[PDB]
Each structure stands twice: as C-alpha cells, then as structure tokens.
C-alpha cells in the first residue's frame, strides 16, 4: 500500500455538546488534537480518514480497515483516496477559527441532533457561511437517532427538507448515523465518493500557503543538546511544495520595543514535512501539513500564528492597512436565539472583518451604496481577491451580517 | 549491643579523668555508668562530689567531670572524686570526652552493617589509630585529608570503610526566558547552552529554561551566573531576536 497524502479537505460543522469529535473518531480512528505546548493554537484539530473501496452491495461498499474481512470478500481493497479532516467547533464565542477552517475547505458535513429543537440559529449561520465561501458539496447528517421515536425522526427530516429549499445547496444528501454505536458509516463513505469530485489542480499556479496551527517539538526529561525545529501546521490550496525551499511568513513581526520597524517578513527554510503520519518529499495541495521549518520553537507556542499567509521565495504579494471592499447585506440576522433586522452601516464603528483566515478588527470611513473603505488595526495581506465574511456587534458578542470582496 | 572500652583498657588508672551520666541518686552517693572508660559502674560517696543546693544540681540525666582515686582491678570497682578537679583542665577534659564520643559514633556504622560484634571492630581500629598516633579522631581526620593510617591494618570490609568515608564527606536556581522572533533561533539556543551548561541545565516546556549552578563556597555562584547571563545577552542581539532575564 502506497503512502499517499491528503487529496481533498473535508470539514465538519455542528453545535456545542452535540458531538463532532466522536463522529470524527468513528469515521477514522486517530484521536483529535483538542478534546499547553503541543496542539494548542486554535480551535480546529487534526484528523485523517481512509477511502478504500471493495468492488468485486446496496450501500455497503467502503470500509475503514485496510484489510477486507468484515463483509464477506477476502480480496484486498482498492486504493481510491486519502482525506484530511478539519473539525471546527460550533460555539457562540469562538467563530474566527471556524471561519479560517472554511477558507481551505472543499467539502462540508452538517451535524444536527435528533432529541433537541429543530430550528437552531448557529447551524443556520454555519450553513450561510458555507454558502458564502464557495462551497456547494454539503451532506446533512443526523446525530442522535437511537434516542428518538419511529415517526419523530421522520418528522424532523421533513422539517429539515422544508427548511432547505431557497438556499444555494440544492441536491444535498441526508444520512442518519450513530456516533456512540458505530454504524451506517459505509453509506457516508459511499456518498463521499459519489457526490463530491476533486477540482482540477495544476503545477502552473504560484505557491500560496495558509497556516492555522503552530507546533513546538520539545520533550521533558531529555537533554537540550537534542533539539527539534519549529513546526508550522499549514494547509495548501494551490502550489506544489518540495523539500528544499525558502518560505516567508508575510504580515510581519515586532522584534524591538523607540525606533521605527523596518524588518522584513519572517524567512525560514523547510527542514521536514509532516503529512498524515510519516514524512514525505512532495506536498500535494488540498490538505493540512505540519511544515517543520528553521523558525523558532518559542514563536510556534500558542496564540501567535492564527491565520497567516505564507509564500515561497521569488514571489511578491501586497500588504494593506486600508482596504477597499464591495459588500452585500442580508435582510435579517443569523445566529441570534428571536430574529433582528439588519441596520445600515454607520461611520466610525469597530467591526470584525474576516478575510479568508485573518481575524482583524476594522473601522469604517466612507459608505456609498456597495463600496466601503476600512481601516485596519492589525496588518493584513491581499493576493488575488479572497472570500470575506463580515461580523458586527449589537448585543454582547459577534454576529454575522453578510459577504464582501476586495476590488483590486 | 553497645559495650567495650573507649581508650585501651577496661579499668581506669590513677589521676585520670572520667565523665559520668547519672541515673539515680541519694543512697550512698552516685554509683553510675561511665562514658570515658567502658560501661562498668563507678561510685562517689556523699563528700567528694560537693565542691561548694546539693540535691538539685545533679539528679537525673546530667553529666559530671570527676577524677579517679581508688581502683580495684579484679572484676570492676572504680572510685571517683569531683572536688579535686581544677577549673583550668576542665575544658581539656570536656574536649577529650567529646573526642571519645566522636570515636564511639564512628564505630557504630560498622556494627550496624556487617552484623559483627562491636568490640572486635573497636580492637581492630584502635591498634594503628589510637595507639601509634595518640587519639583516634585526629588520626581519622588525617586519613580523610591524606590516607596514611588506614594502610597499617588490612580491611576485612572495604564496603564499610567506603560508607564511613561517604558519611564523613550548593545548587542555586536560575531562570532564563527565551522569546525570539529571528530567522534562525535553535542554533543560537544551542550555542548559548554550549556556554551556560559547562552544571545541570534542564528543559521544561518552550519559553523557560531551568538551570542549577553549583557553588564551592556558597558565594561563588554569583560570578558564573552573571557571566552566563551576559553570554546569553551577547548571543541574541546580533541575529534579530530577544531573550529576557527576570
């Protein structure tokens, strides 16, 4: 069996205490990163699934084990795909991480529990976000079905169907699956192969990398004369990387505190790539890879590198402090428990603008009709156009309003 | 079991000094156990004990310095006197007693370890140490400084001797904070370590480094730590990073 890395990024959405990590575990096997130094940087974890098919019935086709002994046929499984999971939490406080996750995602999985209430605002918000950030491949999954009645589940399904009609997602498949009992995952696997294809990707496009997580490889007990370099957990959308290249983290860093800053973006040479489980020479875009570079282990510790752009040497992108946005607003607010009408944008107000993966606070200067000018406090970079989600404050915490695009 | 003589012989001589620990009083005087010559009882009558509150001063537990007058070398009969002892030599006597005590302490570990009689051990020790040199404590001290007295007698147990030596025979904590933002940092850290370690330096997490510096005469630990700090400061300024010292 060949040790091929991740091909396409699949993300999972839900709610707090509903069950997402458990679902992930059921799907794959290797436990999630979340659940001080290691793993702790963002809200998303790190998981990997296997797609191997046995074609020699009905729904049972794909399996989780490398060896086929369970259904009947003793023949070895055929290699189809290998996928990486991006598990994003569905909490009312933390959403920036989710947004960041969304930017890299190509496939989405919705989770709704049976026993709880049918209309949930957070889930709706998530769906809206998915719709916004160039995602159409959505599979609806029912979580807690075993604690539900014979007709109640059907009713719930009907309600769901009624709800999802006016949205961009038209032909979304619905699957009921148990997380604690471990059943009906084969159907899900089959669907993964059926409904979702891999988009065309080539070597010709300039390299662009997005770092979500940060890792330091340090072990207690062992002497200091045996050290390992700083690892940046970064996912790639476009551009193939190989071992032996110069990488730079774009936005900038503060090294001296009197004296104006002039220091260039953080340069680092690649030491080792951590994909799936074992080290590989080539990096196929469409997966999260722990890129171990010559960067400090102290820098890759905690909340320092959350959603930052990474480029290869011989390419020049632009850094902006003032940004030109073309926005579109929604009718009523999504996320609030009760629904409130969206007000027109007022000059000089602190609003959270999420350009791809960056979590930045911006203030509005001029409003016309569709074009808006924003002043940023923390530095941000622009490459092409980018997919932007806008968030405002009305009551206590952040609420989503609509979508935006950079006009440059 | 604790027994055997302290100096050379079981029975004391004439004019020599002995220390006594009193258990019970008021019958004849004090017929109590000795600490300078064996554990055989020595007696004072109610006249030689007083020099100048007569019942209160001694009673139970307290130590007394007394000179030997009458000796009966047959089975164990010693006579003591307190009045004759002069104030000038009392300090000397005390010192001697202390030395004896130390010697006794030294000959206990052996008894404990190899489960063999203490008296035999004492006999084996006293021949080259307590006879040829003078007193035993000084000989022991000499040996510890430069080994010359242990050479005289062959050791039946070297392990015991080693243990004794061990018995006869300062870490200062420091914290250095690392928070670099430069291009290369690991190498710098390694370099720093190569100048700070050579005593014991350990890694805990990522921004904190814990080091324990050993001092010979307690005050010496300040001179090295400061130097190390200076070296660390020198290290990170050139590349373009920062390291802080609390």
Coordinates of C-alpha atoms in Angstrom, one line a residue, chain A residues 68-333:
Chain A
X68 CA -11.3 -6.7 4.0
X69 CA -12.6 -9.4 6.4
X70 CA -15.9 -7.9 7.6
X71 CA -18.4 -8.0 4.7
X72 CA -17.6 -11.4 3.0
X73 CA -15.0 -11.0 0.2
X74 CA -11.4 -11.9 1.2
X75 CA -9.7 -9.8 -1.5
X76 CA -7.6 -6.7 -0.8
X77 CA -9.2 -3.2 -1.0
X78 CA -8.6 -0.9 -4.0
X79 CA -6.9 2.5 -3.5
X80 CA -9.3 5.4 -4.1
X81 CA -8.4 8.5 -1.9
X82 CA -6.9 9.7 1.4
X83 CA -8.6 12.6 3.1
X84 CA -7.8 15.1 6.0
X85 CA -10.5 16.3 8.4
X86 CA -10.8 19.8 9.7
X87 CA -13.1 19.8 12.8
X88 CA -14.4 23.2 13.6
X89 CA -16.3 23.9 16.9
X90 CA -19.8 25.4 16.8
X91 CA -19.7 27.7 19.8
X92 CA -21.3 31.2 20.1
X93 CA -18.0 32.8 21.4
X94 CA -15.4 31.2 19.1
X95 CA -16.1 31.5 15.3
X96 CA -12.9 33.0 13.9
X97 CA -11.3 29.6 13.9
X98 CA -14.3 28.1 12.1
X99 CA -14.1 30.9 9.5
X100 CA -10.4 30.2 9.0
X101 CA -11.2 26.5 8.5
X102 CA -13.9 27.3 6.0
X103 CA -11.4 29.2 3.7
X104 CA -9.5 26.0 2.9
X105 CA -12.5 23.6 2.9
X106 CA -13.8 22.0 -0.3
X107 CA -16.4 19.7 1.3
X108 CA -18.8 20.2 4.2
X109 CA -20.6 17.9 6.7
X110 CA -23.6 19.3 8.7
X111 CA -24.5 17.7 12.1
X112 CA -27.9 18.1 13.8
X113 CA -29.0 16.1 16.9
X114 CA -32.5 14.5 16.9
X115 CA -33.7 14.9 20.5
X116 CA -33.0 18.7 20.7
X117 CA -35.0 21.5 19.0
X118 CA -35.4 21.6 15.2
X119 CA -34.6 25.2 14.4
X120 CA -31.1 26.2 15.7
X121 CA -29.6 29.6 14.8
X122 CA -25.9 28.6 15.0
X123 CA -26.4 25.8 12.5
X124 CA -28.2 28.2 10.1
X125 CA -25.3 30.7 10.5
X126 CA -22.8 27.9 9.6
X127 CA -24.9 26.9 6.6
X128 CA -24.9 30.6 5.4
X129 CA -21.2 30.8 5.9
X130 CA -20.7 27.6 3.8
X131 CA -22.9 29.1 1.1
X132 CA -20.9 32.3 1.1
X133 CA -17.4 30.7 0.9
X134 CA -17.6 28.9 -2.4
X135 CA -19.0 25.6 -1.1
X136 CA -21.9 23.6 -2.6
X137 CA -21.0 20.0 -1.7
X138 CA -22.9 19.6 1.6
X139 CA -24.0 16.4 3.3
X140 CA -26.6 16.6 6.1
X141 CA -26.1 14.1 8.9
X142 CA -28.4 13.2 11.8
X143 CA -26.5 12.6 15.0
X144 CA -28.7 11.2 17.9
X145 CA -31.3 8.9 16.3
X146 CA -31.2 6.0 18.7
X147 CA -32.9 8.0 21.5
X148 CA -35.7 9.1 19.1
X149 CA -39.1 7.6 18.1
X150 CA -40.1 5.9 14.8
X151 CA -42.1 8.8 13.4
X152 CA -40.4 11.7 15.2
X153 CA -37.2 11.3 13.2
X154 CA -39.2 11.2 10.0
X155 CA -41.0 14.4 11.1
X156 CA -37.6 16.0 11.8
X157 CA -36.3 15.0 8.4
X158 CA -39.4 16.5 6.8
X159 CA -38.9 19.8 8.7
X160 CA -35.3 19.9 7.5
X161 CA -36.4 19.3 3.9
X162 CA -38.9 22.2 4.3
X163 CA -36.2 24.4 5.6
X164 CA -33.6 23.7 2.9
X165 CA -35.1 24.8 -0.5
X166 CA -34.3 28.5 -1.0
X167 CA -30.6 28.1 -0.3
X168 CA -27.7 27.6 -2.8
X169 CA -27.3 23.9 -1.9
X170 CA -30.0 22.1 -4.0
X171 CA -29.2 18.3 -4.1
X172 CA -27.9 17.8 -0.6
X173 CA -27.9 14.1 0.6
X174 CA -29.2 13.2 4.1
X175 CA -27.8 10.3 6.1
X176 CA -28.7 9.1 9.6
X177 CA -25.6 7.9 11.6
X178 CA -24.8 6.8 15.2
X179 CA -21.6 8.2 16.8
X180 CA -21.5 6.1 20.0
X181 CA -22.8 2.9 18.5
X182 CA -20.6 3.0 15.3
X183 CA -23.0 2.2 12.4
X184 CA -24.0 3.3 8.9
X185 CA -20.6 5.0 8.1
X186 CA -20.3 2.9 4.9
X187 CA -23.2 4.8 3.3
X188 CA -21.4 8.1 4.2
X189 CA -18.2 6.8 2.7
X190 CA -20.0 5.9 -0.5
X191 CA -21.6 9.3 -0.6
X192 CA -18.2 10.9 -0.2
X193 CA -17.1 9.2 -3.4
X194 CA -20.4 9.7 -5.3
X195 CA -21.4 13.4 -4.8
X196 CA -18.1 15.1 -4.2
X197 CA -15.5 15.3 -7.0
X198 CA -11.9 16.6 -6.9
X199 CA -11.5 20.1 -8.6
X200 CA -8.7 20.5 -11.3
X201 CA -5.4 21.5 -9.8
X202 CA -2.0 22.0 -11.6
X203 CA 1.7 22.8 -11.0
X204 CA 1.5 26.1 -13.0
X205 CA -0.1 28.2 -10.3
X206 CA 2.1 30.3 -7.9
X207 CA 2.5 28.8 -4.4
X208 CA 0.2 30.0 -1.6
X209 CA 0.1 28.6 1.9
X210 CA -2.2 29.3 4.9
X211 CA -1.0 28.5 8.4
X212 CA -3.8 27.6 11.0
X213 CA -1.9 25.8 13.8
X214 CA 1.5 26.1 15.4
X215 CA 3.7 23.3 16.9
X216 CA 6.8 23.1 19.1
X217 CA 8.6 19.8 19.3
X218 CA 10.1 19.7 22.8
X219 CA 10.1 16.7 25.2
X220 CA 10.6 16.8 29.0
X221 CA 13.4 14.6 30.5
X222 CA 15.7 14.6 27.5
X223 CA 18.8 16.9 27.3
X224 CA 18.9 20.2 25.5
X225 CA 21.7 19.0 23.1
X226 CA 19.0 17.1 21.3
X227 CA 16.6 19.7 19.8
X228 CA 13.9 19.9 17.1
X229 CA 12.9 22.9 15.0
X230 CA 9.7 24.9 14.9
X231 CA 6.7 23.3 13.1
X232 CA 4.1 25.3 11.3
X233 CA 0.8 23.4 10.7
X234 CA -0.2 24.9 7.4
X235 CA -2.7 23.9 4.7
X236 CA -2.3 24.5 1.0
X237 CA -5.0 25.4 -1.6
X238 CA -2.7 26.0 -4.6
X239 CA 1.0 25.4 -5.4
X240 CA 3.1 22.2 -5.0
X241 CA 5.9 22.2 -2.5
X242 CA 9.1 20.0 -2.3
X243 CA 11.7 19.6 0.4
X244 CA 14.5 22.3 0.0
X245 CA 12.8 25.7 -0.5
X246 CA 12.7 29.2 1.2
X247 CA 9.4 30.2 2.9
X248 CA 8.3 33.6 4.2
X249 CA 5.5 34.5 6.6
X250 CA 4.1 37.7 5.1
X251 CA 2.3 40.1 7.6
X252 CA 5.4 40.9 9.7
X253 CA 6.8 40.7 13.3
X254 CA 7.8 43.0 16.1
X255 CA 11.4 42.3 17.4
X256 CA 12.4 45.6 19.1
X257 CA 10.4 47.7 21.6
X258 CA 11.7 53.8 20.3
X259 CA 12.9 53.0 16.8
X260 CA 10.8 52.5 13.7
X261 CA 10.1 49.0 12.4
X262 CA 11.7 48.1 9.0
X263 CA 12.4 44.3 9.4
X264 CA 11.3 42.0 6.5
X265 CA 8.7 39.1 6.6
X266 CA 9.9 36.0 8.6
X267 CA 12.2 34.0 6.4
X268 CA 12.6 30.2 7.1
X269 CA 14.0 27.2 5.2
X270 CA 12.0 23.9 5.2
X271 CA 13.5 21.1 7.3
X272 CA 10.9 18.4 7.4
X273 CA 7.2 18.0 6.2
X274 CA 4.7 16.2 8.5
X275 CA 1.9 14.7 6.4
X276 CA -0.7 12.2 7.7
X277 CA 1.8 10.1 9.9
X278 CA 5.2 9.8 8.1
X279 CA 7.5 12.3 6.3
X280 CA 7.2 12.9 2.6
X281 CA 9.2 14.7 -0.1
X282 CA 6.3 16.1 -2.1
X283 CA 3.4 18.2 -0.9
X284 CA 0.1 17.8 -2.8
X285 CA -2.2 20.8 -2.3
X286 CA -5.6 20.1 -0.6
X287 CA -4.5 19.1 2.9
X288 CA -3.1 20.3 6.2
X289 CA 0.7 19.6 6.6
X290 CA 2.9 20.3 9.6
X291 CA 5.6 22.2 7.8
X292 CA 8.7 22.0 10.0
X293 CA 10.9 25.0 9.2
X294 CA 14.0 26.8 10.6
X295 CA 11.7 29.1 12.6
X296 CA 12.0 29.3 16.4
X297 CA 10.1 26.8 18.7
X298 CA 9.3 29.8 21.0
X299 CA 7.4 31.6 18.2
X300 CA 5.3 28.5 17.5
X301 CA 3.9 28.2 21.1
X302 CA 0.3 29.4 21.4
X303 CA -1.8 32.3 20.2
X304 CA 0.7 34.0 17.8
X305 CA 0.2 32.4 14.4
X306 CA -3.5 32.1 13.8
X307 CA -4.5 32.6 10.1
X308 CA -1.4 34.0 8.4
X309 CA -0.3 33.8 4.7
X310 CA 2.9 32.0 3.6
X311 CA 4.8 32.4 0.3
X312 CA 7.8 30.9 -1.5
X313 CA 10.9 32.9 -2.4
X314 CA 10.6 34.6 -5.9
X315 CA 7.1 35.9 -5.5
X316 CA 5.8 39.3 -4.3
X317 CA 2.2 39.9 -2.8
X318 CA 0.9 43.1 -1.4
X319 CA 0.3 44.2 2.2
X320 CA -2.6 46.5 3.1
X321 CA -3.6 48.7 6.0
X322 CA -6.5 50.4 4.2
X323 CA -8.8 48.0 2.3
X324 CA -11.4 48.5 -0.5
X325 CA -14.4 46.2 0.0
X326 CA -17.5 45.5 -2.1
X327 CA -20.2 44.3 0.3
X328 CA -23.7 42.7 0.2
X329 CA -26.1 42.7 3.2
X330 CA -28.7 40.2 4.4
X331 CA -32.3 41.0 5.5
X332 CA -32.4 39.5 9.0
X333 CA -29.6 38.5 11.4

